[PDB]
Structure 1
Amino acid sequence: AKQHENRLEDKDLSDLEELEDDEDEDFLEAYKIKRLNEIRKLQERSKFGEVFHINKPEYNKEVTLASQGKKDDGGVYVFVHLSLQSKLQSRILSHLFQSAACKFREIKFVEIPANRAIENYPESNCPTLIVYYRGEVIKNMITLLELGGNNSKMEDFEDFMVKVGAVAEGDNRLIMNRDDEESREERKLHY
């Protein structure tokens, strides 16, 4: 049953063209128009793409209004970062935000100093990662010992975005699914 679904489900618009000579045109082009429409929706939703270094008055808008988005429940995820330059984990998490911002343009990446965020915040609890969605806090994450701590990598951060429902599991942009071209080249030769 899955062998028929893998022709369309496991191929993007660039990979669907492989089956142009083999499979029927009406079977293939019917799905390419569907996948083409999904690509256009992501382009319209790409309202972001760099870290929004904000300040508090604005928090009451950027962090929360955005989380409502269109309010068609067009919700928008907003990853906040209570930065603290003295901590080593904070500078690591700041690099992950800019790296993920260039890839996931639909998700908003927010950064602010922790001293300016909350009155007399504990410095030991920093860096803090909050995830808003439709005005509600989906995840109040603590320091990155859960995500490896000092040895945190980009692969661990992208895996966390899938757990909170920010990115799909089978997304082609994730490093877990985005296999290298040399990897797929060896598979075709050994097939």
Structure 2
Amino acid sequence: AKQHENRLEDKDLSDLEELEDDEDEDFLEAYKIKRLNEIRKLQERSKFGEVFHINKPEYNKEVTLASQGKKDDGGVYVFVHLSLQSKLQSRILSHLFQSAACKFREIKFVEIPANRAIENYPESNCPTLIVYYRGEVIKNMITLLELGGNNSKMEDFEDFMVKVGAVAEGDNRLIMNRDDEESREERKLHY
């Protein structure tokens, strides 16, 4: 049953063209128009793409209004970062935000100093990662010992975005699914 679904489900618009000579045109082009429409929706939703270094008055808008988006429940995920330059984990998490911002343009990446965020919040507690969605806090994450701590990598951060429902599991942009071209080249030769 899955062998028929893998022709369309496991191929993007660039990979669907492989089956142009083999499979029927009406079977293939019917799905390419569907996948082409999905690509256009992501382009319209790409309202972001760099870290929004904000300040508090604005928090009451950027962090929360955005989380409502269109309010068609067009919700928008907003990853906040209570930065603290003295901590080593904070500078690591700041690099992950800019790296993920260039890839996931639909998700908003927010950064602010932790001293300016909350009155007398413990310095030890931050680096603090908050995830808003439709005005509600989906995840109040604590320091990155859960995500490896000092040895945190880009692969661990992208895996966390899939757990909170920010990115699909089978997304082609994730490093887990984005296999290298040399990897797929060896598979075709050994097939």
Structure 1: which 4+ aligned runs deviate by more than 3 Å? none
For residue 52 of structure 1, what is the aligned residue in structure 2?
52
Q: String of CA shifts for 1:98-118, please: whole Å, max 9, x gaps.
A: 000000000000000000000
Query: 2: distance between equivalents of 1:152 and 1:126?
Result: 16
d(CA) in 2 for partners of 1:124 and 1:163?
A: 26
Quote the sequence identity (%).
100
* Residue 160 of structure 1, CA deviation: 0.0
SS of 1:41's equivalent in the other structure is helix
Q: Secondary structure of the residue that 1:184 maps to in structure 2?
A: helix
Compute the displacement of 1:55 (Å).
0.0
Q: Deviations over 1:102-137 (max 9, x none)?
A: 000000000000000000010111100000000000
Q: CA deviation at 1:32?
A: 0.0
Deviation per residue, 1:62-101 (Å, 9 max, x gap): 0000000000000000000000000000000000000000
Q: Distance in 1 between matches of 2:121 and 2:168?
A: 34
Structure 2 residues not aligned, in runs of 5+ = none
TM-superposed CA distance for 1:10, in Å, is: 0.0
Deviation by residue 1:28-56 (Cα, 9 ceiling, x = unmatched): 00000000000000000000000000000
- Counterpart Cα distance in 1 of 2:125 and 2:176: 30
Residue-by-residue CA offset, 1:118-169 (whole Å, 9 max, x unaligned): 0001011110000000000000000000000000000000000000000000
| Unaligned runs of at least 5 residues, structure 1 | none
Q: Distance in 2 between matches of 1:64 and 1:76?
A: 10
Secondary structure class of the residue paired with 1:110:
strand
Is residue 133 of structure 1 aligned with residue 110 of structure 2? no
For residue 21 of structure 1, report the CA deviation from its aligned partner: 0.0
2:9 is aligned with 1:5: no
Map residues 12-161 of structure 1 onto 2, 5 A cutoff: 12-161=12-161
Q: Distance in 2 between matches of 1:125 and 1:160?
A: 20
CA distance in 2, matches of 1:122, 1:156: 26
* C-alpha displacement of 1:181: 0.0
- State the Cα distance separating 1:174 from its structure 2 match: 0.0
State the secondary structure of the residue aligned to 1:131: strand
Normalising by structure 1, report the TM-score. 1.00
The alignment partner of 2:33 has SS state of helix
Distance 1:123 1:102 in 2: 29
Find the aligned partners of 2:84 and 2:60 in 1 and give their Cα distance: 21
